[PDB]
Write a protein that binds this ligand. Structure first.
Ligand SMILES: [Zn+2]
Length: 341
């Protein structure tokens, strides 16, 4: 089921003119038959902002969020761009809410968006915000202001919080569940949990390669697999690591085993995907997923959390560069550093 023919382009062609309200009418027509695209909302929101109708813009944005649409970064950028000319507590709170959105969803502005954020903070009267484009030292200290970036390490209470909430959703087969729980609970914590079949994407001979090199690092390995794999070179894996072979069904065992093992335990699988809990999951995933990148090497895992963050008197905002294509599984390396004087 589609939009009424050509409506997206009609909307886009209207929003700079005095007839921009007609674009909203068209949007209403679209809503009555399908969920509008993030571009549809982007266009109508910019139309509103272009004509100083800030309430209409924000209501559209909230409507979008309500449909669980992820806004275009270009849309978030528009609110900051128009914000440099707006002096009002309520508009500012909305912009700070967009920053919380980025923080909570582990998202990052593009380079010109970062410039727009910098420009906005530096435009806020009486607050003396200064922005700089920076990197972070190995220690966790911003190369700009000297502050230490939030630790990537969850506190024990945070970890118990996250681990607790995760379990209640895990509790496929009841028979396989209890068997796995018995397996795990009668064994010491592991150091790396390996999803055997998922890692074999870059066959069984690839699994041996991973296990055998990780074993030389004096790590306690747990390899997770399915019944079908053991039908030779798999026997060489079973002897170098602890293994659990579940039914050929997706299973939740990787999470359970890693979390049960504890805050120190890392894992290997494919790219993984209330605000406070989700925020903890992102932070835990960032600091615990071992990503593989001839001879095998893993992605660096930093000591600090690469995420939009604040101390009130400072913000640190990772951003993507135009000239740098970043894989989903690597964290940005460039930061916008904002500090009050
Ligand atoms: Zn800084």
């Amino acid at each position: 089921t589609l939009e009424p023919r050509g409506y997206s382009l009609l909307i886009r062609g209207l929003i700079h003119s005095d007839r921009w309200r007609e674009a909203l009418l068209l949007l209403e027509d679209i809503k009555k038959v399908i969920t509008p695209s993030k571009k549809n909302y982007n266009d109508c929101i910019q139309g509103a902002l272009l004509h100083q109708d800030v309430n209409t813009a924000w209501n559209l944005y909230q409507e979008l969020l309500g449909h669980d649409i992820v806004p275009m970064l270009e849309t978030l950028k528009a609110f900051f761009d128009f914000g440099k000319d707006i002096k009002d507590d309520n508009y500012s709170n909305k912009l700070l809410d967009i920053l919380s959105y980025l923080r909570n969803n582990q998202l990052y502005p593009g380079e010109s968006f970062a410039h727009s954020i910098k420009t906005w903070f530096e435009s806020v009267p009486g607050k003396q915000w200064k922005g700089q484009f920076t990197t972070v030292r190995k220690s966790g200290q911003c190369s700009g202001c000297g502050k230490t970036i939030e630790s990537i390490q969850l506190s024990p209470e945070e970890y118990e919080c996250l681990k607790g909430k995760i379990m209640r959703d895990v509790i496929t087969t009841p028979q396989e569940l209890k068997r796995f729980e018995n397996f795990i609970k009668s064994r010491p914590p592991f150091d790396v949990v390996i999803d055997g079949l998922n890692v074999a994407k870059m066959e069984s001979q690839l699994l041996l390669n991973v296990v055998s090199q990780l074993a030389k690092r004096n790590l306690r390995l747990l390899v997770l697999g399915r019944k079908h794999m053991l039908r030779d070179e798999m026997e060489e894996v079973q002897k170098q690591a602890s293994c659990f072979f579940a039914d050929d069904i997706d299973d939740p065992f990787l999470l359970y085993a890693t979390l049960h093992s504890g805050n120190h335990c890392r894992f290997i699988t494919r790219d993984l995907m209330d605000a406070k809990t989700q925020r903890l999951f992102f932070k835990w995933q960032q600091g615990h997923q071992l990503a593989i990148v001839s001879k095998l090497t893993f992605q660096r895992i930093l000591s600090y959390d690469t995420v939009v963050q604040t101390t009130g008197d400072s913000w640190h905002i990772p951003y993507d560069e135009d000239l740098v294509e970043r894989c989903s599984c690597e964290v940005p390396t460039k930061w916008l550093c904002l500090h009050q004087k």
